[PDB]
Design an enzyme around this catalytic site. Structure first.
Site, short mmCIF file in Angstrom:
data_model
loop_
_atom_site.label_atom_id
_atom_site.label_comp_id
_atom_site.label_asym_id
_atom_site.label_seq_id
_atom_site.Cartn_x
_atom_site.Cartn_y
_atom_site.Cartn_z
N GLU C 352 49.70 63.34 11.54
CA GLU C 352 50.47 63.66 12.77
C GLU C 352 50.93 65.11 12.71
OE1 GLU C 352 50.58 61.58 15.22
OE2 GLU C 352 49.78 59.82 14.17
N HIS C 482 40.94 49.68 23.56
CA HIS C 482 40.43 50.94 24.17
C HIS C 482 39.57 50.66 25.40
CE1 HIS C 482 41.39 52.19 20.07
NE2 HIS C 482 41.58 53.42 20.60
#
Ligand SMILES: *CCC(=O)N1CN(C(=O)CC*)CN(C(=O)CC*)C1
Ligand SMILES: *CCC(=O)N1CN(C(=O)CC*)CN(C(=O)CC*)C1
Lengths: 17, 596, 591, 17
Positions: C352, C482
Site C-alpha cells: 500500500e 470482479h
C-alpha cells in the site's frame, strides 16, 4: 467521408469530386 | 429551448442548403463525365469542394447535440450520419498526405502503360490495350507478358504508396476508436441498438466464411471442369491436379471467367441464346432497349421514368465533339433529377446492363420518399443486388420470347439450359472465391496479421489455398499484385460483391415465390407481377431508414444473408458437373506452379 | 487556446475532486448514512463538472492540437462524460450494476444441516474455503454460493453483456472486451504504439511459456491433496474446484500447510517475533517508510500519520476494512488498513505504501495525467516491495529474523513453493476468466453454452473440474466479485508479469548477485531513482516507453518470472519424475 | 471508465462513490 452517393459507379479517385 | 427541437432547427436549416449543393456538385460532375473540359473539371472541383466544406462544418455543428437526449428515431439517424461521417479525423498534414497518396495511386493505375518489348516506343494501357489480350488472347506467352508487365511495371510503383496508405488509414480508423481500417469498413454492415435486428462487424467475417464453406463443393467442381478444358487449350502448361495459371483466366486478375466460355461451353453444338442478331434485324436502338426496360418495371407495378430522364440522359456516345466517360453509370442529381450515362450498343449484353442500371434509378427514386441523409441503400451490397435481379429475369428465355427477340417456337432443352447456367457461374461462382480472398487479405493486412515482409507471399498462399489459382512467375515484396486492381489502388471496399451476390438470389427466390413460380428458379421472369414488384418496392422505399437486416426480412422472411438460394439456382449445374468430372480429378495442389 | 481551458479545469477539479475523495474516505472510515449523503451529493457534483467540461473540450479538435501532452490530456475528457446510451437503458444498466453488487455483498447461504445457521461469503463461507478439510463442508459452501447467488445474477449478467456491448459499439469498439483492452492501446508515438489485438496475442503467447511450470505445481499439489482427500482425488484427473483454498481457486496460498515441501524445517513466522518484541501498527508502517527512504524516496507526509486509519476504530465507529491507499490531492494522502501484527499485514503495508509513493511521485504531473501508465502498473509497484521485504536478508536487516538461520535451499523451495501458490496459480485462473468474458463479449459464446464452455475452459486451461454438473441456470463466473462488479481482470495478469520485469532490472541496478528470489533492493539509490523516473511519468508517456525506461524492454516478458521460479521448476520436475504430469479433462468427481 | 482514481483498491459498486 460521404453520406449520399451522387451516382452508382465507383469513379477514379483522380479527377472526381 | 429543447435540444430535440434545437436539432430540428439545425437539420431543417442544413437539409435546405444540402439539397441545393448536392445537385450543384452532382450536376457539374455529370457535365464533366459527359463533356470532359477544363471548365467542366474546374466547375466539378469548385463544387465538390464547397460541398465537402459544408458537410464538415455541419458535421461538427451536429455533434453539439447528443443523441441520448433525442427520442425521435428519424432525426437521430439523420444526426448520426452527419456526426459519424464527420471526417478530418487525421492531422491537416497527414490528411494532405493520404489524399496525395490516393491521387498518385489512381493517377498511375489509369496512366499505367506497358511497353511491348517489340516496340520500346509503342506501349499499351489496361484499357483498351491490355484488357483486350487478357479477355480474348489464347497465347500463354502473350497473356503472361501482360499479366507480369502489369504487376512488374506498375504494381511495383504502388507497393511503397500502398504501405504508407495502410498506415494513415489505420491511424484514422483507430482514432475513431476502431480496431483498424478493415473493421471500420465492416462498419457499413453494423446495426447497434435495435432489439431483434442487431449486427456486429465480426459477424460479417463469420458470415462471409460459414457461407463460403457451403460454396466449396460447387466452385471445386466448376474448377475441376474449367481446368479439364483449359488443358485442351494449353496441354503443355496445366497440371491435371494443380491450380490455374493466374494469366489464363479471361481477366487481368481472373475476377470473372466470363471470357473462358468459348473453351468451356458444355454443348457448343446447341444453338446460342444471344439475340443481338434479332435486335439488329428488328432495327433496335438505345431508346428502344431502355423503353423495353421501363416496360418490365411497369410490368411489376413500378413507375415509368421521368421526362428529364429521356431528355437529359446520355444513352449514346456523344461522338468525337463531346468527349465522354463510357462507364454504365446511373445518377441521382437530387431535386427529382435522375439520368443514365451509357454509350449503349445494340447487343444483348448492353440490353441487360440497361435493366441493371435502371434498377438503380428505380431505387434512387424509390427512397426520394426518405430525407436526404436516409436517401441511400441499406448496405453497399443492396444497390448492386437490385440491378442484378432484373438482368437475372430479363435474360430468361420466357422474357426474351415475350419481347420478340427469341422465336416463340424456341426449345428450352437441358442442353441449352446448362450452357446458360455454366456461363452464369463463370461470372458468378468464379468471382466469389476471388472476392472473399482479396478482402480477407486486406483485412488481415489492416488488422496486422500479415507483415510487409510477407505481403505478396501470403497473397499467393491464399490465392492457391482458397482460389486454386497459382501465379505463373514467383513474386517478391517488390510487387503489389493486389494493388494492381482499381478498387484496391482507388481505396474501395470489395466484399460488396460477395454480399450483393448472396442477396440477389434470395431476392429472386422470394420475388418468384411471390409470382407463384413453378419450377427451376433460373428460368424465372418476375415480369407482369405486381405482388413481387410491391414486396421489392416496400424495401426499395425504406432506403437508409431501417436496419438492412429488416429490409432483408421484409422481402425474404429472414434477417441475415443466406446461400441456400444461390445453391438452388445452380443445382442443375452442380449435379451435371459432378457427373462430368466423374472421370476427372477435383481440388488442387497448393504447391505445384508453372515454374516447377 | 485549449491550454488555458485546461488550467481552469485543473484549478477547479482539484477543489471538487478533493471533496469527493474525502467524502468516500470518511464514509469508508465511518459508515454514516450522512457520509453517503455528502459522498453522493459530491459524487453528483463531480459527475456534473466533468460532464460539463467534456462538451467544452469536445468543442476543440485534437487534430489541430500540435502540442502532445495537452492532446493526451484533452483525449481523456472527450473520451469520457458522454452517456452514449438511452436514458432508459442507462438506468437499466446502473440498476443491474448495483443489483449484482448488492446480491454479492448481501448473498447468504443456509446449511440444510442447520437451516437456521446461514453464512455470508465474508467471512463464514470464505473461512470454510480458506481453512476447512472436509469435502462435504467445502462442497456445500462452493455449490450453495453458486446454486443461489449465481443463478440469481445469471439474467442480470445476460442483460449486462447486452447493454454493455451497445455502449461499447456505440463508441466504435468491437465489443465491451475490446473497450477494456483499449486500456493498453497506444497511438501517435512512433515505435511505442500497441493494438487491442496485440494484447490478446501477447497474453496467449506468454501463457504458452507458463503452462509447463504450472503443470508440475498442479501435479505436485494434486500429489499432496491426494493424502488429504484420497477417495475424492484422481492422480490423472483435474483438481476439484472447491479444494483450492479460496471460493474460486483464485489463489492456492491457503494450501501451503498441505503442500509444504520440508515440514519440520524453520516455518517462517516473523509474526511471533513481532509479538515477542511487542510490535504495533506504528512500527509496521514506520519500518516500511525507512525502506522507501533507504532507496532514495521521500518520507511519508505528516498528514499520512495523522489522517490515515491503520487500526480498526472499535465498535464506536465501523469502517470498510480493506487495505487501501488514497490519492485525495491538495497534497493529502492516506492509508485505510485495519492493521494487525502479522507478516502478511507487514508486507501488505509496504505494498500500500508503494501505491502512496507512486501517487506522491506522479502528483506533480498534470491532474489528468495523475494515473498509472496502465491498469497493471500500480498493482505491480506494490507487489515488488512486498517481494523485497519477504527476503530472508531484509528480515535479518530488520531483525524479526535471528542471524542464526542458514539460507539453505530446503528453505528456498519452502519460500518459492508458497510464492508460487499465490503468483503462478492465479495466472491459469486470471487468463481463462478474462478470456471467457472477452469471448462472451465478442459473442463467440452462445448463452446456451456459457457454463459448459466456462468449465470446458477451466478443465482445459486450469485443470480444475466443477464437482457437481452445472446447468445454464448458474452464473459461476459472476460468483466472483470482479465479474459481478464490472471490473477488468487482465490487470492481475499484466501486473504479475510486469512485477518480475521491474525487480530484475532494479536488482541489476542494485548490483545484486545470485538468484532474484533473494533480492532485497533495500539501500539502493540507483534502483530507486530508476523506479522513481517511471512513477513520476504517471500516464504522460505510453506504458511501453515507461516499461523500457525501467526494464529496457518495450513489451511484457515472462523470462523474469520464469527465472524467479526456475529453482522450484527443477525441484518440481525431479519431484514429478515418477509422477504423471498434465490432466485428463474428461474426468470429474461425479464420473 | 473514470478519469482519476482517488484510491488503489476496487470497492463494491453498491456504496462506491
Ligand atoms: C460521396 C462520394 C461518392 O459519391 N462516391 C465516391 N467516389 C468518387 O469517385 C469520389 C472521388 C465514387 N463514387 C461514385 O462513383 C459516384 C458516382 C461514390
Ligand atoms: C474513478 C473510479 C475509481 O477510482 N475506481 C474505479 N472504481 C469504482 O468505480 C468504484 C465505484 C473502483 N475504484 C475504487 O474503488 C477507488 C479506490 C477505482
Amino acid at each position: 467521408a460521404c453520406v449520399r452517393s451522387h451516382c452508382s459507379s465507383l469513379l477514379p479517385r483522380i479527377h472526381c469530386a | 429551448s429543447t435540444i430535440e427541437e434545437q436539432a430540428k432547427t439545425f437539420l431543417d436549416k442544413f437539409n435546405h442548403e444540402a439539397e441545393d449543393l448536392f445537385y450543384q456538385s452532382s450536376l457539374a460532375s455529370w457535365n464533366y463525365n459527359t463533356n470532359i473540359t477544363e471548365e467542366n473539371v474546374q466547375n466539378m472541383n469548385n463544387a465538390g469542394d464547397k460541398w465537402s466544406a459544408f458537410l464538415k462544418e455541419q458535421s461538427t455543428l451536429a455533434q453539439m447535440y447528443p443523441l441520448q437526449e433525442i427520442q425521435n428515431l428519424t432525426v437521430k439517424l439523420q444526426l448520426q450520419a452527419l456526426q459519424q461521417n464527420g471526417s478530418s479525423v487525421l492531422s491537416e498534414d497527414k490528411s494532405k498526405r493520404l489524399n496525395t497518396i490516393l491521387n498518385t495511386m489512381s493517377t498511375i493505375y489509369s496512366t499505367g502503360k506497358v511497353c511491348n518489348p517489340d516496340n520500346p516506343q509503342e506501349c499499351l494501357l489496361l484499357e483498351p490495350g491490355l484488357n483486350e489480350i487478357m479477355a480474348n488472347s489464347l497465347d500463354y506467352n502473350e497473356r503472361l507478358w501482360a499479366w507480369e508487365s502489369w504487376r512488374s511495371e506498375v504494381g511495383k510503383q504502388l507497393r511503397p504508396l500502398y504501405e504508407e496508405y495502410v498506415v494513415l488509414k489505420n491511424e484514422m480508423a483507430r482514432a475513431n476508436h476502431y480496431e483498424d481500417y478493415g473493421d471500420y469498413w465492416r462498419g457499413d454492415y453494423e446495426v447497434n441498438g435495435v432489439d431483434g435486428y442487431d449486427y456486429s462487424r465480426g459477424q460479417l467475417i463469420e458470415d462471409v466464411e460459414h457461407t463460403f464453406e457451403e460454396i466449396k463443393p460447387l466452385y471445386e467442381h466448376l474448377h475441376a471442369y474449367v481446368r479439364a478444358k483449359l488443358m485442351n487449350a494449353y496441354p503443355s502448361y496445366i497440371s491435371p491436379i494443380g491450380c490455374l495459371p493466374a494469366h489464363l483466366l479471361g481477366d487481368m486478375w481472373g475476377r470473372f471467367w466470363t471470357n473462358l466460355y468459348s473453351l468451356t461451353v458444355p454443348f457448343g453444338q446447341k444453338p446460342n441464346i444471344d439475340v443481338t442478331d434479332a435486335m439488329v434485324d428488328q432495327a433496335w436502338d438505345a431508346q428502344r432497349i431502355f423503353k423495353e426496360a421501363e416496360k418490365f418495371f411497369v410490368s411489376v407495378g413500378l413507375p415509368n421514368m421521368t421526362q428529364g430522364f429521356w431528355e437529359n440522359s446520355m444513352l449514346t456516345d456523344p461522338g468525337n465533339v463531346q468527349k465522354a466517360v463510357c462507364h454504365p453509370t446511373a445518377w441521382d442529381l437530387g431535386k427529382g433529377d435522375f439520368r443514365i450515362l451509357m454509350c449503349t450498343k445494340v447487343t444483348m449484353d448492353d440490353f441487360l446492363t440497361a435493366h441493371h442500371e435502371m434498377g438503380h434509378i428505380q431505387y434512387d427514386m424509390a427512397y426520394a420518399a426518405q430525407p436526404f441523409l436516409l436517401r441511400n441503400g441499406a448496405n453497399e451490397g443492396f444497390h448492386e443486388a437490385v440491378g442484378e435481379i432484373m438482368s437475372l429475369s430479363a435474360a430468361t428465355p420466357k422474357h426474351l420470347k415475350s419481347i420478340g427477340l427469341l422465336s416463340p417456337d424456341f426449345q428450352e432443352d437441358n442442353e441449352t439450359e446448362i450452357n446458360f447456367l455454366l456461363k452464369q457461374a463463370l461470372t458468378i461462382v468464379g468471382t466469389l472465391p476471388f472476392t472473399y480472398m482479396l478482402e480477407k487479405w486486406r483485412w488481415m493486412v489492416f488488422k496486422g496479421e500479415i507483415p510487409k515482409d510477407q505481403w505478396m507471399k501470403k497473397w499467393w498462399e491464399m490465392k492457391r489455398e482458397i482460389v486454386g489459382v497459382v501465379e505463373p512467375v514467383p513474386h517478391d515484396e517488390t510487387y503489389c499484385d493486389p494493388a494492381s486492381l482499381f478498387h484496391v489502388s482507388n481505396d474501395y471496399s470489395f466484399i460488396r460483391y460477395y454480399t450483393r451476390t448472396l442477396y440477389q438470389f434470395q431476392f429472386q427466390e422470394a420475388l418468384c415465390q411471390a409470382a407463384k413460380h413453378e419450377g427451376p428458379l433460373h428460368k424465372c421472369d418476375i415480369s407482369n407481377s405486381t405482388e413481387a414488384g410491391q414486396k421489392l418496392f416496400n424495401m426499395l422505399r425504406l432506403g437508409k431508414s431501417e436496419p438492412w437486416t429488416l429490409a432483408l426480412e421484409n422481402v425474404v422472411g429472414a434477417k441475415n444473408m443466406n446461400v441456400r438460394p444461390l445453391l438452388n439456382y445452380f443445382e442443375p449445374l452442380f449435379t451435371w458437373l459432378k457427373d462430368q468430372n466423374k472421370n476427372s480429378f477435383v481440388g488442387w495442389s497448393t504447391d505445384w506452379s508453372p515454374y516447377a
